[PDB]
Amino acid sequence: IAKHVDSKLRAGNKEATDEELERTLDKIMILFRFIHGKDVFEAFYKKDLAKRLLVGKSASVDAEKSMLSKLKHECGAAFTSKLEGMFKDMELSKDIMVHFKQHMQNQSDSGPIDLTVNILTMGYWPTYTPMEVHLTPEMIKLQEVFKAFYLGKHSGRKLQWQTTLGHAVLKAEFKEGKKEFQVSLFQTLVLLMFNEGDGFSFEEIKMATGIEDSELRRTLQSLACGKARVLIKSPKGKEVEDGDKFIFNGEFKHKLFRIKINQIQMKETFQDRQYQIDAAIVRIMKMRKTLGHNLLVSELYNQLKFPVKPGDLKKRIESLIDRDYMERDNPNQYHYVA
Amino acid sequence: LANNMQEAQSIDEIYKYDKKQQQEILAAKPWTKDHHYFKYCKISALALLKMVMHARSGGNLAVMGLMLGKVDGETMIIMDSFALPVEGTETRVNAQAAAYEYMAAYIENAKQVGRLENAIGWYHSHPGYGCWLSGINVSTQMLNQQFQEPFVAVVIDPTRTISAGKVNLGAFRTYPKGYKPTIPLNKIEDFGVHCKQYYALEVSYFKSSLDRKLLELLWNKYWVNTLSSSSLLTNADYTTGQVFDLSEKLEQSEAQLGDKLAKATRDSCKTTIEAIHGLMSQVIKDKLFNQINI
């Protein structure tokens, strides 16, 4: 159900709208307010927000924070939580990028390449470790410079880079016409390392770049196949083995002065525990008749060995209070009531 | 053991059962007139011992059973207690099928031997859960009291009793439907949310002449704890609290006067008698020990 509102909030050129977009967003929340199972909707919206902000840019942050504020009502400040964090992270990334641009323009103004960082927080975002692929020497200088600048600005943070969720542009010089590529890091690395030399075999790509075998296979699946003109090869569909002799053809007659082969985004590949928790809740009561919520949670954590998530605690407390096993005037206290 | 009486003593008529008197008091039904009728529950030593042993033998689980006896005047006498074959969890007990057959068969068999008493109440053990009536005990006690009127709910705590060394037995009776009527809040807290629905009773214990005679020779090493008793020292807080409650009772009786004086006089006499007994024991010790080789 959240896919509809994600598509409505997505950038769509002509999809751009006016205040009636805000009215439609309010209508969507009107349809949502009586829908149960909010956890699934929240998780889907978190994934959608991460996809829209982490890679690419959405239609407008305006309606984004408007929707976040609207979900804050009728739900609670602690319920939203992460999405506000992602929005603040995007704002901080923009500010830090402006500051880094000023710093680069100030001292030793050379600007070989145009860096654009999107520093995120470890906890909020759905992070994932990169392949630890070795970056080619053209972009190592900017990595070092920005690392030094970030360490100078913020003290004791450490940057955990992710070379799997970024973009770049390469000025191709095959023949006449500087076909500006738009590539992911893997394709940038492959093309740049192929620039020095010619006809590197697949094992040579593995050794020089260091990409994982599966990811390198997926990357080299592109730069060919589509339209059967990016790279001419006798096999079709998928055929890549160790020691394969592949070389880029010395001509690129793609009939448009805007090359985007970063098409990877498009061609992208309890009952027993609940019983134990309920029994623990019952046993904590029928003793301490009036108990606070945090005290009850701490008591159950003490009485149990395996960790268990607080979400299980909350859902079991709600389920067992639904059965008239307790009653709720402070809102963080429970009486026994049998 | 001599220079006294050895025949039927004055503490044995409590064990005697009179069928005619019980029938007359059951036909009279004086409980329905004043609903604050029963205020005292007298339990035999055997019944209390059996209850405590059965409650502790159940471990961390809960157990339940019945208790026989009768009712006289303003007091309920509980003579014997027999367990039930119940299988209960750590919180709740059910007594689904075999408990009722056991009740009927055991009552019939006891009547065969000579047990002339009828069932007088039920008890259920809280394994470390205090001594109070839960929302289910209140409902079942109301169910029993609506039809089988002479009844009482006895709650025992085995874990707290074994940990603290003192028995925790509570006798309770439920009010009917619609019957509304630095100080600690435990008076309301230690009861459940149904604190206004049931009221407690004064629990006392009694034993027979043969019971006391046999228990006198139970063990012959508590004499050391009697000679070095150190009375008036282990219960000073008890006497101060008794004096405070006695002052409150005296104030209430004085306010009323301007029959309540009788219980205040009784409490004062009890406290003074305890103090005088302690002083007498101390004087006896001083005469025995420190008055030699002077």
Side-chain angles (χ1 to χ4, degrees), chain A residues 178-194:
Chain A
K178 314 158 153 305
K179 324 251 165 163
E180 169 160 322
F181 274 80
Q182 219 150 272
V183 278
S184 184
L185 295 303
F186 297 153
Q187 326 191 314
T188 307
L189 278 165
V190 165
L191 296 177
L192 260 162
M193 151 295 300
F194 188 151

Side-chain angles (χ1 to χ4, degrees), chain B residues 7-266:
Chain B
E7 222 45 74
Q9 219 148 336
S10 310
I11 67 186
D12 287 351
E13 84 289 54
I14 194 63
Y15 271 77
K16 165 150 164 85
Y17 188 77
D18 195 73
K19 175 99 147 179
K20 142 182 288 303
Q21 176 190 8
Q22 284 324 112
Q23 294 291 270
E24 281 143 354
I25 205 165
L26 229 55
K29 322 185 72 68
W31 37 70
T32 325
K33 310 318 292 172
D34 184 25
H35 254 297
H36 266 255
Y37 197 39
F38 310 101
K39 305 166 188 162
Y40 312 97
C41 158
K42 291 184 78 187
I43 325 185
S44 310
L46 180 58
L48 155 76
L49 189 49
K50 289 208 262 191
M51 280 179 249
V52 173
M53 288 207 17
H54 177 221
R56 183 49 172 156
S57 100
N60 230 330
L61 324 171
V63 308
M64 85 179 322
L66 275 203
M67 54 193 37
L68 319 173
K70 66 220 188 73
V71 48
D72 65 300
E74 241 195 321
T75 57
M76 316 188 79
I77 286 164
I78 300 178
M79 298 264 220
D80 196 277
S81 147
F82 68 97
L84 287 178
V86 79
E87 320 307 312
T89 89
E90 292 135 30
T91 290
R92 205 162 154 105
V93 285
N94 280 339
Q96 58 284 320
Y100 311 131
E101 286 159 7
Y102 192 83
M103 293 169 186
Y106 188 92
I107 286 201
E108 186 50 54
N109 283 4
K111 278 218 180 45
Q112 274 198 33
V113 151
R115 201 65 194 193
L116 295 191
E117 278 89 2
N118 283 325
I120 209 65
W122 73 289
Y123 74 98
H124 146 60
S125 60
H126 296 9
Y129 306 148
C131 212
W132 51 281
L133 278 197
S134 148
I136 174 68
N137 321 321
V138 173
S139 83
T140 194
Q141 170 86 326
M142 261 197 267
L143 178 49
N144 282 338
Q145 264 190 30
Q146 263 178 236
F147 320 112
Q148 299 158 120
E149 184 57 79
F151 238 74
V152 54
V154 156
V155 189
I156 195 97
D157 195 326
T159 281
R160 164 201 311 281
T161 282
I162 188 77
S163 94
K166 268 79 148 204
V167 315
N168 270 51
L169 206 142
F172 310 91
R173 270 180 59 85
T174 172
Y175 295 123
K177 345 277 208 175
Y179 249 81
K180 323 145 293 313
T182 88
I183 176 189
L185 253 68
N186 82 304
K187 152 173 192 177
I188 305 288
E189 174 57 27
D190 81 14
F191 301 141
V193 316
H194 314 84
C195 167
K196 83 200 146 298
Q197 260 279 348
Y198 64 89
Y199 74 103
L201 280 85
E202 197 45 72
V203 184
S204 33
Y205 313 98
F206 66 96
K207 57 163 151 194
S208 79
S209 78
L210 181 59
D211 273 28
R212 167 180 71 190
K213 279 164 61 177
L214 284 165
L215 263 288
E216 191 75 11
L217 326 174
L218 91 170
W219 191 288
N220 302 312
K221 256 293 281 182
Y222 294 73
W223 65 291
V224 168
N225 284 339
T226 312
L227 293 189
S228 64
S229 48
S230 188
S231 321
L232 317 92
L233 263 67
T234 81
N235 63 350
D237 291 16
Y238 194 100
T239 64
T240 60
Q242 279 311 286
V243 163
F244 274 128
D245 309 302
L246 178 62
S247 152
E248 304 270 11
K249 270 179 197 132
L250 258 294
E251 164 211 17
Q252 276 158 51
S253 303
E254 145 85 7
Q256 183 265 290
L257 162 53
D259 53 9
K260 315 207 76 182
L261 199 37
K263 84 202 171 273
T265 305
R266 206 145 69 76

Side-chain angles (χ1 to χ4, degrees), chain A residues 124-234:
Chain A
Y124 312 166
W125 292 81
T127 87
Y128 170 50
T129 167
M131 301 315 78
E132 323 160 27
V133 47
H134 333 98
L135 31 79
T136 36
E138 312 59 25
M139 63 212 57
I140 187 178
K141 203 182 161 324
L142 277 305
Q143 203 247 6
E144 288 205 308
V145 163
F146 180 76
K147 202 31 190 76
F149 156 77
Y150 199 79
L151 246 200
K153 173 167 288 319
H154 298 165
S155 50
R157 269 193 203 280
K158 157 173 57 95
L159 283 195
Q160 211 288 328
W161 286 61
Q162 292 175 21
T163 64
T164 86
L165 309 164
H167 334 97
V169 283
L170 308 182
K171 206 143 174 270
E173 328 283 354
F174 304 150
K175 278 174 144 73
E176 83 274 13
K178 314 158 153 305
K179 324 251 165 163
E180 169 160 322
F181 274 80
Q182 219 150 272
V183 278
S184 184
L185 295 303
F186 297 153
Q187 326 191 314
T188 307
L189 278 165
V190 165
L191 296 177
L192 260 162
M193 151 295 300
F194 188 151
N195 158 43
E196 276 322 290
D198 286 308
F200 296 174
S201 93
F202 154 71
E203 206 42 56
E204 291 214 40
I205 319 289
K206 272 285 295 278
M207 281 195 328
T209 317
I211 315 170
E212 196 252 310
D213 178 35
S214 187
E215 319 275 41
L216 172 34
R217 144 79 83 176
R218 264 81 176 252
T219 292
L220 267 275
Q221 180 52 52
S222 303
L223 301 98
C225 166
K227 267 62 164 159
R229 71 172 37 90
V230 200
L231 247 180
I232 287 202
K233 287 291 157 323
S234 308

Side-chain angles (χ1 to χ4, degrees), chain A residues 274 278 316-326 338:
Chain A
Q274 281 182 354
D278 254 350
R316 291 328 303 196
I317 285 180
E318 279 335 282
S319 198
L320 177 131
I321 200 164
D322 155 81
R323 282 197 268 260
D324 257 315
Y325 260 61
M326 312 146 288

